[PDB]
Ligand binder design. Sequence first.
Ligand SMILES: Nc1ncnc2c1ncn2[C@@H]1O[C@H](COP(=O)(O)OP(=O)(O)NP(=O)(O)O)[C@@H](O)[C@H]1O
Ligand SMILES: [Mg+2]
Length: 350
Amino acid sequence: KNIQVVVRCRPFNLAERKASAHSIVECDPVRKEVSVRTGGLADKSSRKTYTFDMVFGASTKQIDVYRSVVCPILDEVIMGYNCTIFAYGQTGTGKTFTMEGERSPNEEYTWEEDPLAGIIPRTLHQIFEKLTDNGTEFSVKVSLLEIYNEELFDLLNPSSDVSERLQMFDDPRNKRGVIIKGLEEITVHNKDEVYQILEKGAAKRTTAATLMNAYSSRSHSVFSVTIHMKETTIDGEELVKIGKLNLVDLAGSENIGRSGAVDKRAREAGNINQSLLTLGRVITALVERTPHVPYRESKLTRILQDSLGGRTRTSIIATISPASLNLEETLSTLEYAHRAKNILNKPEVN
Ligand SMILES: Nc1ncnc2c1ncn2[C@@H]1O[C@H](COP(=O)(O)OP(=O)(O)NP(=O)(O)O)[C@@H](O)[C@H]1O
Ligand SMILES: [Mg+2]
């Protein structure tokens, strides 16, 4: 029911160290708290403390995030629930690193084995493991799209033609969802098939350089895995359930004064910030029990509508930087992520 919200603080990066930035973030997984020194060079004691469902410090390894957050989600999907996990936070704090991850040097590991692997590569591997172990008759279908400047583009369409803006419509046979017309939904039979498709897909997800992040996501990435399951019980009863998992890598809050974003990059930041703002208003509207929730004001919240206050089991991974340089941005991330904890969802099997 209640949306699960966890926070992950990444390690200081080079630029922060070279700028002699100091640490203003303390994570306490035990108490499940994140405290932020809000004082300034003046006050070095005053702290702002938030309590979440789970808190991951700078030493948190990919596998830790997965075992703690994803594994339980994965089983729910197998149960026939609709689930969503999305990474949220300031540009450069670890959303993409967390959702997709990277690859260790010299092929010392296969994708699934890699300690740098993110949530998505691990989940595609695990999905088949659990399904084969389950015994059900199953079919797996995947899709990947990015929301770029309020337009939708399929990232898995293999065609050579330039990608067209996909149109979105409410699902006729389901008032709790949308339909992306023309979106490719590729049937996959094992991790190898999925991995080939995934790396090519994630590779073309619009990424560009900004002073804050040389590898900044210029769009919100939405990777969906739909699983059709059909089994026959010992009672000769045939049950058909459908599970779905949305792994979302959002673009992140960006102060163009700091990112130095110009024209095209600035245009992207404008859309990114506006869409995230709309996400914040949706969250706030749900926590305040407001008569209206502004889902329709952005393609992001339309896609995430059922995930936010609907019949989807949702988990949020708020990513933050430990540097004193990002006090306002960090507080903003923690504040909205904290509010999200109070949103009540009504998950139900399909
Ligand atoms: N937990 C971590 N451990 C090591 N490196 C990290 C970690 N988190 C983030 N990074 C690195 O910082 C750079 C990533 O920024 P990420 O790609 O993490 O930014 P982002 O949140 O996707 N930025 P943005 O797309 O603008 O919202 C990556 O090359 C990562 O390797
Ligand atoms: Mg990114």
